[PDB]
Design an enzyme around this catalytic site. Structure first.
Site, mmCIF file in Angstrom:
data_model
loop_
_atom_site.group_PDB
_atom_site.id
_atom_site.type_symbol
_atom_site.label_atom_id
_atom_site.label_comp_id
_atom_site.label_asym_id
_atom_site.label_seq_id
_atom_site.Cartn_x
_atom_site.Cartn_y
_atom_site.Cartn_z
ATOM 1 N N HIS A 40 -29.856 -54.184 36.998
ATOM 2 C CA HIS A 40 -29.689 -55.284 36.056
ATOM 3 C C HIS A 40 -28.392 -55.075 35.257
ATOM 4 C CE1 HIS A 40 -31.523 -52.869 32.634
ATOM 5 N NE2 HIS A 40 -30.746 -53.686 31.863
ATOM 6 N N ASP A 84 -35.262 -51.472 40.059
ATOM 7 C CA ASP A 84 -34.100 -51.659 39.185
ATOM 8 C C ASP A 84 -33.180 -50.430 39.297
ATOM 9 O OD1 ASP A 84 -32.287 -52.617 37.395
ATOM 10 O OD2 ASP A 84 -33.541 -52.238 35.592
ATOM 11 N N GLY A 175 -27.792 -51.610 25.899
ATOM 12 C CA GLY A 175 -26.644 -50.723 25.999
ATOM 13 C C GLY A 175 -26.974 -49.319 26.545
ATOM 14 N N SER A 177 -29.254 -49.189 28.960
ATOM 15 C CA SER A 177 -29.649 -49.588 30.345
ATOM 16 C C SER A 177 -28.857 -48.826 31.369
ATOM 17 C CB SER A 177 -29.380 -51.081 30.689
ATOM 18 O OG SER A 177 -30.240 -51.996 30.059
ATOM 19 N N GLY A 178 -29.546 -48.382 32.428
ATOM 20 C CA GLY A 178 -28.913 -47.663 33.514
ATOM 21 C C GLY A 178 -28.751 -46.153 33.295
HETATM 22 N N1 LIG Z 1 -37.925 -50.696 25.452
HETATM 23 C C1 LIG Z 1 -36.826 -50.419 26.160
HETATM 24 N N2 LIG Z 1 -36.401 -49.155 26.262
HETATM 25 N N3 LIG Z 1 -36.131 -51.403 26.754
HETATM 26 C C2 LIG Z 1 -34.982 -51.195 27.640
HETATM 27 C C3 LIG Z 1 -33.750 -50.703 26.904
HETATM 28 C C4 LIG Z 1 -32.546 -51.075 27.770
HETATM 29 O O1 LIG Z 1 -32.275 -52.455 27.607
#
Ligand SMILES: NC(=[NH2+])NCCCO
Ligand SMILES: OB(O)c1ccccc1
Ligand SMILES: [Ca+2]
Ligand code: NA
Length: 223
Positions: A40, A84, A175, A177-178
């Protein structure tokens, strides 16, 4: 990262920042030529920044390397976030040293309750926004598959784990993410999704990397 602390500089040497004019996602170095991240996070052009601590200042140990290949999992679903996961091949090998290092893939999946380290440059505020210069860290356990599925009824697949705290206050955020979830020296999670961040009974959901070691090895051997 909400509810974390500032990592010691370069103490997370497998952490990368993915940059496309600014930092937008994390990733993990798993071979000298390959980073793993979240699908994503996809963009068609990405610069990988290795050896970072302060993403706003050149400190001297950075390596900035453009992605040559960006491969999302063929069964990534943008609705459910299943699968993902994304691999990025660097245009030149990272040079491995004390500040830029690979992290092992998982030898097995992680027991519930295993302690992990989550890191990134994502939002640090549960109200409003604050994007940090300095890499943030959070210690968090792998939650029960029970606790995870109760938090998100019908939404947790066999390719997802929850890691974090049901009370709230401690989570990955936009931020991050990944980026990595490393437990006993193994990359067990990729920051994937959740309902906002750090909310009560809405723990972070992470791609379950122990299901993807074959896909990762096969993609590396074929590109
Ligand atoms: N609750 C979470 N850790 N959500 C995902 C965080 C990355 O957008
Ligand atoms: O995490 B979850 C969970 C499962 C059983 C008992 C307590 C917590
Ligand atoms: Ca820097
Ligand atoms: Na609930």
């Amino acid at each position: 990262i909400v509810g974390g602390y500032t990592c010691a500089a370069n103490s997370i040497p497998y952490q990368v920042s993915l940059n496309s004019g600014s930092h937008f996602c994390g990733g993990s170095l798993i071979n000298s030529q390959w980073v793993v991240s979240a699908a994503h996070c996809y963009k068609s052009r990405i610069q990988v920044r290795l050896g970072e601590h302060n993403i706003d200042v050149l400190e001297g140990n950075e390596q900035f390397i453009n992605a040559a290949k960006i491969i999302t999992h063929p069964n990534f679903n943008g609705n459910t976030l299943d699968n993902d996961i994304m691999l990025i091949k660097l245009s030149s090998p990272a040079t491995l040293n004390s500040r830029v290092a690979t992290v092992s893939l998982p030898r097995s999946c992680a027991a519930a309750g295993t302690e992990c380290l989550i890191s990134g440059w994502g939002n640090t505020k549960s109200s409003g926004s604050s994007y940090p210069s300095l890499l943030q860290c959070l210690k968090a356990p792998v939650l029960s598959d029970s606790s995870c599925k109760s938090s998100y009824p019908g939404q947790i697949t066999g390719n997802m784990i929850c890691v974090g705290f049901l009370e709230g206050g401690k989570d990955s955020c936009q931020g991050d993410s990944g980026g990595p979830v490393v437990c006993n020296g193994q990359l067990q999670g990729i920051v994937s999704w959740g309902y906002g961040c750090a909310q009560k009974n809405k723990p972070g959901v992470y791609t379950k990397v122990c299901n993807y070691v074959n896909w990762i090895q096969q993609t590396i051997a074929a590109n």
